[PDB]
Design a binder for this molecule. Structure first.
Ligand SMILES: [Mn+2]
Ligand SMILES: [Mn+2]
Length: 183
C-alpha cells in the first residue's frame, strides 16, 4: 500500500482499543472519503480544488470592495465555489448511498446563504454533487451547474475506504457503545 492515508488509517485501527477513539477513526475515514471525491471531481471539471471556504471569504473573493459588517453573514463553510463572472455557484460534495444528507445541506444552505446573497446583489445557486460510494454514480443538484458540466468524467473507486471502515466495525462489532456512536 503505497498510500500513506490508508497506512495511517490502518495503523490507527490496529492500535485502537476504546469506542470513543474508534468513533473518531470512523468519522475521519468518512471525511477522507468525502475529500477524495472532492479532489477527483475538481480535477475532472478543471476547477480549482478547495475544501471548506468560509462564506465571508467567498464574498470577499467575489466582491472585494464589500463591507461585510453591513450584512448578516452566516459563518458556514461550503466545500468550494465557482464564480462565473455573473453567477456564484456554492459547491458542496457528498459521498452517500442516500439522499438525506443532501436534503439537510440543501435546506440549510438555501435558507442561510441565499438571503444575504440577494442583499449583497450576487446571483447565487446552491450546488450539491453526490457520489454513491457503492455504485460510483454521480447526482447533481443545481441547474446552472448541470448546464456548465453536462457530464462528470471521473473514475471513482471507494473500495479502500470501505475496507478500512469494515475493519474498524468488525473490531468493535460487540461494543454496544461504539455501535450507538456510529448509529
Ligand atoms: Mn465540507
Ligand atoms: Mn460536503
Amino acid at each position: 500500500m503505497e498510500d500513506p492515508m490508508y497506512e495511517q488509517f490502518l495503523q490507527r485501527i490496529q492500535a485502537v482499543r476504546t469506542a470513543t477513539v474508534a468513533k473518531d477513526i470512523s468519522a475521519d475515514i468518512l471525511e477522507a472519503r468525502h475529500d477524495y471525491f472532492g479532489r477527483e471531481l475538481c480535477r475532472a471539471l478543471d476547477i480549482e480544488y478547495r475544501n471548506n471556504v468560509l462564506l465571508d471569504e467567498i464574498i470577499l473573493d467575489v466582491y472585494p470592495g464589500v463591507n461585510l459588517m453591513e450584512y448578516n453573514v452566516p459563518h458556514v463553510t461550503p466545500d468550494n465555489y465557482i464564480w462565473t463572472g455573473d453567477m456564484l455557484l456554492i459547491l458542496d460534495y457528498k459521498v452517500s448511498v442516500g439522499h438525506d444528507s443532501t436534503e439537510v445541506t440543501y435546506k440549510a444552505y438555501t435558507t442561510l446563504i441565499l438571503p444575504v446573497m440577494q442583499e449583497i446583489g450576487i446571483n447565487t445557486e446552491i450546488c450539491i454533487i453526490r457520489a454513491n460510494p457503492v455504485t460510483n454514480q454521480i447526482s447533481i443538484v443545481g441547474e446552472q451547474f448541470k448546464r456548465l458540466f453536462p457530464t462528470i468524467p471521473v473514475e471513482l473507486n471507494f473500495a479502500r475506504f470501505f475496507e478500512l471502515r469494515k475493519m474498524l466495525l468488525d473490531k468493535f462489532a460487540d461494543d454496544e457503545e461504539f455501535l450507538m456512536m456510529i448509529a
